[PDB]
Symmetry: D2
């Protein structure tokens, strides 16, 4: 029941870089109205790694008040520390999320065995909530082989893998060895290709502004309309080329600010403001998506 298209939720801040609750509530609602299947919260996109544990739990609490019952909720409780991750797993459960997820612990190198214990511990603290193993080499620096992936996803309590890797040979080997595994395509720019290789859904940050297109790509491939799938993917890719140039999170928040969802589109330091020169393309995009 976790298969699907889930937006990786952004965290709106106020001018003082404090949580902007009203914009967070707006953002959750905006996503629901968009037809999203669920939300992945407290992930990279939520700026979790520049947030405190209490701040991350406050967010989980607010979106559950806002979305529990309406759409699927996955809480990324991942920290480098197993104990901090367990604390967040207990809050996700306490607030009613449908699953937890954790990036592979980073900075310090850990063995495959250390990664398994880390996941086992979080799973135990999740008290029943399935675990979403999260592989994202580019940001974490943890290069996971297919064999290591097999070990992690076969752990008791692991019901899914968020694959943020562009290796689509591995995407299909994973699907072939694990037929029942929920597999989330992680890179928005290769979504269509990801689904064809074996992913059965996706989690992405750009879904916050055009989640309807990814759902569109999914319907297309289902209705055997490769052509429409391709057109949707390239329109997504033109937006991603832009976001990548502007700063992905700040870029997304800016489009959202112009759509009246977010009050102040600031990311937390050390992230800087969006380059003034980008605002016109961003303003235009906002206009274009609203219509």
């Amino acid at each position: 029941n976790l298969r699907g298209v889930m937006a990786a939720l952004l965290t709106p801040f106020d001018q003082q870089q404090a949580l902007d609750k009203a914009s967070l509530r707006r953002l959750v609602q905006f996503n629901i109205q968009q037809g999203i299947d669920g939300l992945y919260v407290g992930g990279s996109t939520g700026e979790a790694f520049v947030q405190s544990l209490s701040e991350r739990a406050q967010v989980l609490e607010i979106v559950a008040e806002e979305a529990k019952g309406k759409i699927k909720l996955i809480a990324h409780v991942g920290c480098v520390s197993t104990a901090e991750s367990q604390q967040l797993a207990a809050s996700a459960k306490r607030h009613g999320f449908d699953a937890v997820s954790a990036v592979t612990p980073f900075y310090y190198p850990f063995s495959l065995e250390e990664h398994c214990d880390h996941y086992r511990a979080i799973i135990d603290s999740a008290d029943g909530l399935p675990m979403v193993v999260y592989n994202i080499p580019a940001l974490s620096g943890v290069k996971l082989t297919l064999g290591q992936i097999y070990t992690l996803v076969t752990l008791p309590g692991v019901g899914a893998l968020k694959q943020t890797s562009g290796d689509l040979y591995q995407m299909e080997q994973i699907r072939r060895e694990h037929p029942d595994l929920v597999l989330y395509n992680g890179y928005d720019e290769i979504f269509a290709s990801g689904l064809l290789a074996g992913a059965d859904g996706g989690i992405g940050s750009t879904y916050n502004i055009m989640g309807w297109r990814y759902q569109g790509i999914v319907k297309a491939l289902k209705e055997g309309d490769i052509q429409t799938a391709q057109k949707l993917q390239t329109e997504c890719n033109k937006v991603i080329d832009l976001l990548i140039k502007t700063g992905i999170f700040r870029g997304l928040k800016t489009v959202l600010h112009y759509m009246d969802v977010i009050s102040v589109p600031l990311c937390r330091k050390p992230f800087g403001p969006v380059d003034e020169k980008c605002l016109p393309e961003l303003k235009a995009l906002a206009q274009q998506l609203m219509q």
Copy 2:
């Protein structure tokens, strides 16, 4: 007119590691009988880099003898040396190949300017044959950015790009920037996803023993039967998994030996022999391929 599905041709040898002329003609014939659209000869797969210019020009000659007019023919002409590359390019036209191709020169680091001159010089010597730039970062060590690729494929005389890269975001970006460029998918393992991304054909080493499967995928995608395409790609990938374990070239030659095509399944040193323990799966692979 050169867009399509082209097998990267293997160079058969005898026990003394010398070109086995008779097996070569048999292999070329076998490829044609599978309904392949053309042959990419003298590339990585034809063991070009452990062959002299004269043995390379000799294979060009024989294959052209065997298939000029029957199917399209692309001659890979690259060498680290610009002058040796030019020399093979003249043989290509001289033997009537439809196009010429050249891997980005490797080992020594070269600038973008130096790489362009390398292709211009070769283009000059190909005397009218369109050039197929060849990007294969994993083996050449040359990682081309989107812009370096832009600069190279827009070189006068360049009519295509062989993209042996698993980055399908780059694949669609290239397509979106060069809508008229011929785009061959380099990694067989991701063929279906590659076409979906924007590639309009493919060149691959495994097409030698199951090229029809890739044709079946082209057709299935055109016909909107995504299901069969995936099925086909899965079946191709089960085979590729095996070949990567056994060693790809020697594994393909061994299979072609069980199909009668090749007499002696040897690659040239430093390539070592296939593992005796592998031969049952390879023999059985051949058997079922006789489907």
Copy 3:
């Protein structure tokens, strides 16, 4: 006055993973007794990335209580978040440290200007304490160029650079460009070579158990006796060889526990316990070091 050999301090925990203050004090005193020039506290070795801010500030406080005025004290105040880093810099000034330091913010990619602004802000908060830029590509994933290093190293308030990089061409290039820069060699396994290249001194994990050997390498090069300098480096590398196999932090802690300096040799999860098979060698190492 910041030039010298400083031990990268470990953080002793109890069986319940909480700070072991009595062992922390012993370790500080142990290092002072070894004739160490100072301590670098709250860095990677202190397991700072699996500690909360409050915990990190508590360690800063206890170490100053034990060592202020006795040896130099540098506070690694860095976090990905600029704000958290500022909070730690203020605690460092509050407790009387001689300097502050911060690793290049990681996980999320940041531009050079974003990095400069992070350091400036932290420098502001340190209220007078100079800054030691910390470059450690292997763990952070940020491989600075000599150019970026120059920009960071020239920021107002930056008094030194901790170079945990094995590229000794860059070390001498940095020394050539900044003849007045305190340059700490960060990879213990190449200390002698690093010093020869231009390193001014060093900061390291292994200094906790054999800091006198590093002091010996300094003196030997100062006396042109490259013969004993290599002897010393060789002994250090046989130990580093073992530590890398056992897990560095836990191996150091195990040796320190066997030397009755710390009560419990555990690291926080996800680091796992030392493999029982390694204990015989760690016990013997501890024995010989004590002599």
Copy 4:
């Protein structure tokens, strides 16, 4: 008796990019005039990968005729092909070279076992000449582990390792493991540091225009005077910085030309020409070295 400083020999060419025999001999004798212990010929620096086998053999001969006797002579005989490597090996014996050498075969990926059989075959064809294994990750793309290096250098017939790696911890581990092994430092910019870590000699391209400085470093460390070893390496690096900016092989030949050793400082295609804006620096350098 192979230990020592050996210049990696450039191969002068004429305007037609053909071998400039008179300039070759002039360079050979010029290295002798400097006081080199031997010359490493037919390697990266000799532009061997952009030369035919016969051209390579021809160079081996001219150099031998000019030097079999006055200095030590090592013949880089490596090709991707083992057979081509064996051919050059036989020629190495024929002109009476002191030792043979071969880069790990590149481009295609090969197993340790294949690399092993490749070296055995060449050793064999070297007819008793000792083999120098050549590890140069950055150009070959072959990253050797300590364990792989161990297997290779303990192959019967192997007498040395040319280590073109900036990993000085690996350098020291190699020395500790094979104290009888001749270990050549491959990167000129870290010569001082490299010998300190355990290399007993060195092979470099910049030795051609300043072999004496390297010889001076070796003596300076023997006489236990790190002071002038550093100052010497600093000078070598100020120069190396320039050769990197200008293009190394072309930058060295150009200096040699202003020193009246080589007729035309041209490298073969795809190497481009030296930027006209650099000539003042290169002349001024050619001027200062002359003393």
